[PDB]
């Protein structure tokens, strides 16, 4: 059964609610982004309207085979009428095609559902600036002060300079980057660009990348693994066993692997600056864990919410324990008292 925080009161609408069968009263199902926890239950057999971004729509059609007649893509930053209700989609600064959704309820209430997001000051100059929001359904993934990490730009700077230095010292090194879903594409694209290489990968990953509207993509990726010195592999294979095995397959073309595992936050963020990160090493294989986040840090989230000044907040992540829920409610009250709303 569909939980309350995925329902939009006073509409026939649900958000990210595909794993509960036919939801009673739901006339339209919104999908914020193409990550499996959110799309769970969609397939070629789905026969209700789905509303989403153009990119999300390409992925529904090609990867899950959802029939065309049921995919309703909407342009961003544009007031749209869906089943008699005004809605807008805003960029979530998450993975490709991820949106936030503003709902203008018939009774005068305004609701923002962030989906998954990484808050940014640039959001303070979207169509959010124009008016008041009564209810905020908030991505609270890292809603605690210990959750600190660098900007995406600094993390990419570290990876580019690390990769360039290694391959310039040894032209026979191979670079590997881990992946398990869309998002974080800048990691492997930035490294391949500095090295003058295309990124090699499986046919299934190439297919997924081809759905994402990235400019010049045909120039950047390839399924010919042999022509490429940046390879993508599933995240599970980024370990000393999996990388040893991979190196054997390359036919004595390479004599070293430098590999990256983009993670979210890890506890080594509590002690170590990005500059000071070191790899794990075994023989001719090194592995760097790098904290590239597509979710708000604590400070980024607090800034957004204190700017928005919502009347009520409903968390959508970490809602399963009493301790979590209590902790998040304490932070929301501090924020409100500090800012005066
Ligand atoms: Ni996500």
UniProtKB/Swiss-Prot annotation:
The lineage of its organism: Eukaryota, Metazoa, Chordata, Craniata, Vertebrata. Expressed in brain, heart, kidney, liver, pancreas, placenta and skeletal muscle. This is DNA cross-link repair 1A protein. It comes from the Eukaryota. It is found in: Nucleus. Binds constitutively to TP53BP1. Binds CDC27, which is itself a component of the anaphase promoting complex (APC). Binds PIAS1. It comes from Homo sapiens (Human). Belongs to the DNA repair metallo-beta-lactamase (DRMBL) family. Changing residue 139 to N: Impaired nuclear focus formation, reduced interaction with PIAS and increased sensitivity to cisplatin. May be required for DNA interstrand cross-link repair. Also required for checkpoint mediated cell cycle arrest in early prophase in response to mitotic spindle poisons. Possesses beta-lactamase activity, catalyzing the hydrolysis of penicillin G and nitrocefin. Exhibits no activity towards other beta-lactam antibiotic classes including cephalosporins (cefotaxime) and carbapenems (imipenem). Induction: During mitosis. The mRNA encoding this protein contains an internal ribosome entry site (IRES) in its 5'-UTR. This 5'-UTR generally suppresses translation while specifically promoting expression during mitosis, when cap-dependent translation may be impaired.
